[PDB]
């Protein structure tokens, strides 16, 4: 489901802390990993009483636990205290977050590459109406590593690449992030790649 978003976040911060992210500022999912055992997720919204959250489990390669908070408790610009307690009673994780400060958008889609230079076009994250406040980043790699990394600002959905070597197979990908400083978070997962031979 949200497998690519969890893989990107895990690749950024690691499995040694409680990873939480939101996709459309109306949801919130917190997850972590273990090399079995049982845990108890609990949260406090402002001065409202503590509330336990239902935990789900799934194998990886390790065991990943997660909790999806009720929509009624995903308010922004508000202190949300999170606590993960082991079944042994031992404290594991303790965080105080704001929903708007953990934004991880869905990966951009509909990426298409054509020759003109090379022009790149894509579509903003699905069901994400903040398109005007979304900044992007384009990766250009070869068979060499990542040759170019281009920043796209102001909600633009078009990119024109320059200085590309001829007779070379380039792979392009685009990630998304919240542009406005009022939001914190992480880059989206990379889009499905598109190849082109100059």
């Amino acid at each position: 489901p949200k497998f690519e978003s969890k893989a990107a976040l895990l690749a950024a911060r690691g499995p040694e802390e409680l990873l939480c992210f939101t996709e459309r500022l109306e949801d919130l999912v917190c997850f972590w990993e273990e090399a079995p055992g049982q845990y108890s997720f609990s949260y406090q919204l402002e001065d409202e009483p503590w509330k336990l959250c239902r935990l789900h489990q799934a194998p990886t390669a390790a065991v990943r636990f997660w909790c999806s908070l009720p929509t009624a408790d995903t308010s922004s610009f508000v202190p949300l205290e999170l606590r993960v307690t082991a079944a042994s009673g031992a404290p594991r994780y303790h965080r105080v977050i704001h929903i708007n400060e953990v934004v991880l958008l869905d990966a951009p889609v509909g990426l298409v590459a054509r020759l003109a230079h090379v022009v790149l076009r894509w579509l903003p994250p699905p069901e994400t109406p903040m398109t005007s406040h979304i900044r992007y980043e384009v990766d250009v790699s070869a068979g060499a590593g990542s040759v170019q990394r281009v920043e796209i600002l102001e909600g633009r959905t078009e990119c024109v690449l320059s200085n590309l070597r001829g007779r070379t197979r380039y792979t392009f990908a685009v990630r998304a992030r919240m542009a406005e400083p009022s939001f914190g978070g992480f880059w989206s997962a990379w889009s499905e790649p598109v190849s082109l031979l100059t």
Partner: antibody
Amino acid sequence: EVQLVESGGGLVQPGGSLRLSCAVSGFTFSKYWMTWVRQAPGKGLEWVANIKPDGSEKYYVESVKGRFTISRDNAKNSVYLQMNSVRAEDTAVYYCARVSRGGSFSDWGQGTLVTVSS
Amino acid sequence: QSALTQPPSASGSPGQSVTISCTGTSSDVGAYNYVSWYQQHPGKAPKLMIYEVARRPSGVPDRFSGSKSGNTASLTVSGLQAEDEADYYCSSYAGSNNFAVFGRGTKLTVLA
């Protein structure tokens, strides 16, 4: 239960300086955003500036950017609005407010008046 | 001050229902659900009546309610009272440099 009190308002000559204070009590002050909203006499409401709970980041409206400076004290539970290089278009009633859920302003202060020439 | 589009005036007899519109762009209202409504009596400071489009603070009667469609939000008071005759502002997130863009303001008058 929540109480907000502004002070330090008054007349200031064009190009002068004035510092507003906002005494806050009734809630965990160091956990919420704080904002300033002014209202020109007979006009509507305008967002001036806001500040993060830890006061690490500050944001301003374009008309006051580089002239005003917002700050906070999470020990005295106070919010300040430093006004340098004041203009005539700054004449308004300045309210300090607590930013809550959904970026709304839950609690407002009585408000203080700042008048500048015209 | 650049602001959102709000009807300048509105009137209604006690018992009636009044709906105040609030139109923005696709970068604020319709982009975020950070829509708020406020009530201001003469000489007094604004009071939060509606937050997050429809949600409502403790102390505010259910008679007030909000909605959102496209780029236009709407506040509605169903059971009009004399104590409701005041100014009503709408707000919305429009960026870090515009954390709350208010409307022009609406003077609601109870004609008795």
